[PDB]
Symmetry: C2
Subunit: 305 residues, 2 copies
């Protein structure tokens, strides 16, 4: 029993983190087989960052202008190339700790674990969602760039995020491991801002189900509603539309608790219209939206890795 | 920027997690060098719950009654003793993945990471705190018994908790790695009352300093307070007494922000009085008490956003 913001065990990813240095820029890289993956802006100085030409800045670098440190061992770079906004450094040595892995692109609303690192040294792990505005509410200081996000499925690490930059509101922006940005961001020092954020409705409903499973029940009511009806309420409070796919995804929690999704929607409707009237839900005064339906099921069932 | 419940990287602990079976009871164990540590109730049957006599249940066991499994490999038990409420199984293979480690008993208010495990396989890692009533608000299903709590300072793993049981209120009790329970709990299925929980005042103050560092001052005020007048107000909200030790420990966060501890105490007093009026602090609409002064220095910039 109990419910907590829970990260995947980070061990399989700890063994992939290395330090990448190019001149006076140090940041983190991901060492899988004989390639180190890291942000392409590693080849830039502050001056270069104002309006970089990457293919141009890259042509000027030899292999020996990239220092790669795996703990207290030097990796010799034998190859460099860009894919979108990530730099691929080929190295002489395959990573013996290379886990089974894939690169995947996640959707807004999907969660993942971030292993925060500094000088190729993992310092912490926390759980995150891709916000509907394609930012993450992370915790990163300078030197964090190249920190990765991941899901574990059986023995298979699914890498989904690499950290590139912080926005002025204090939230974070990055790429998939193929160097495609999440959101309308670019790797340049320029005026960029997070768009208006919205609440991940299906996740709030999943979390209400986690509450019922843990005996928090006061917000349940006798009332039901429809998608159309509820969605007019959703739009009013800056909540994402709820779709038939979302109802389908919540099926396993509606069966396990005997609360129909549109039942639970009627409760969320009431919480949005009236507030929490002094009470909490799972020790929170806010409606929590960084747990997926799968996250709730996985934690309330105990699947291992 | 940002502020998150950050756990330590679990990798160094994952390499120590094993499965321990005795009879029909399976839970987790911690493999360090040639010793596996797990809860002693691994040796308890259905009926033993109420009034187990551990000494009597244990002397009836051989080494070969204890199946220890490290991933796929079976470990040979060559020895066993009880120390307080943990069983220590001597095995014939030193764990090659043993990290630099030590055992430390922690005080209420201290934080640590939990590696939740089932059948010796890790499921997840989260951060929590030793409540003043010596329980922890964990996430822990049946079979989680033997899951451990730890801090990692440099490359050295500090083991401070092994999980033993859930109390009727949905909260968790366990032991240090020498088998002594935190709080007045026992490995028995009897009526044990979790003491009344109080808020860890020193941690709330630390987290208010965190909010200033990340550039939020809306909750400060022009007042100050004496230690004693703060304690008389705070105990009416079920907040732990703040002591000189707690004030000394907040020194560095005082200096980085320029806000004297007692001025921050004045701010907390007012926050308790007013609530937040539809505002948040580091994304929370409650006062958060599961971050320590040391955690805030760890995760927050050395440069305040003024
Ligand atoms: C290992 C099987 C499940 N289990 C045992 C448990 O919780 N038993 C227990 C311990 C102390 C007091 C009362 C208890 O239950 C009546 C754990 O996960 C641990």
């Amino acid at each position: 029993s109990g419910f907590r913001k829970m990260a995947f065990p980070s061990g399989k990813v700890e063994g992939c983190m290395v330090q990448v240095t190019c001149g006076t820029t140090t940041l983190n890289g991901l060492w899988l087989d004989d390639v180190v993956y890291c942000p392409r802006h590693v080849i830039c100085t502050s001056e270069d960052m104002l309006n970089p030409n990457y293919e141009d800045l890259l042509i000027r670098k030899s292999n020996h202008n990239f220092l790669v440190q795996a703990g207290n061992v030097q990796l010799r770079v034998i190859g460099h190339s860009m894919q979108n906004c990530v730099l691929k450094l080929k190295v002489d040595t395959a990573n013996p700790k290379t886990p089974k892995y894939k690169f995947v692109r996640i959707q807004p609303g999907q969660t993942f674990s971030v292993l925060a690192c500094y000088n190729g040294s993992p310092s912490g792990v926390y759980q995150c969602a891709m916000r509907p505005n394609f930012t993450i509410k992370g915790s990163f200081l300078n030197g964090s760039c190249g920190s990765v996000g991941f899901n574990i499925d059986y023995d298979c690490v699914s890498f989904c995020y690499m950290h590139h930059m912080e926005l002025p509101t204090g939230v974070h922006a990055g790429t998939d491991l193929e160097g495609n940005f999440y959101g309308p961001f670019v790797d340049r020092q320029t005026a960029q801002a997070a768009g208006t954020d919205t609440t991940i409705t299906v996740n709030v409903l999943a979390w209400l189900y986690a509450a019922v499973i843990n005996g928090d029940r006061w917000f349940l009511n006798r009332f039901t509603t429809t998608l159309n009806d509820f969605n007019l309420v959703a739009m009013k409070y800056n909540y994402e539309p709820l779709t038939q796919d979302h109802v389908d995804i919540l099926g396993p929690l509606s069966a396990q608790t005997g609360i129909a999704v549109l039942d639970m929607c009627a409760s969320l409707k009431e919480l949005l219209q009236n507030g929490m009237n002094g009470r909490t839900i799972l020790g929170s005064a806010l409606l929590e939206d960084e747990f997926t339906p799968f996250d709730v099921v996985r934690q309330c069932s105990g699947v291992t890795f």
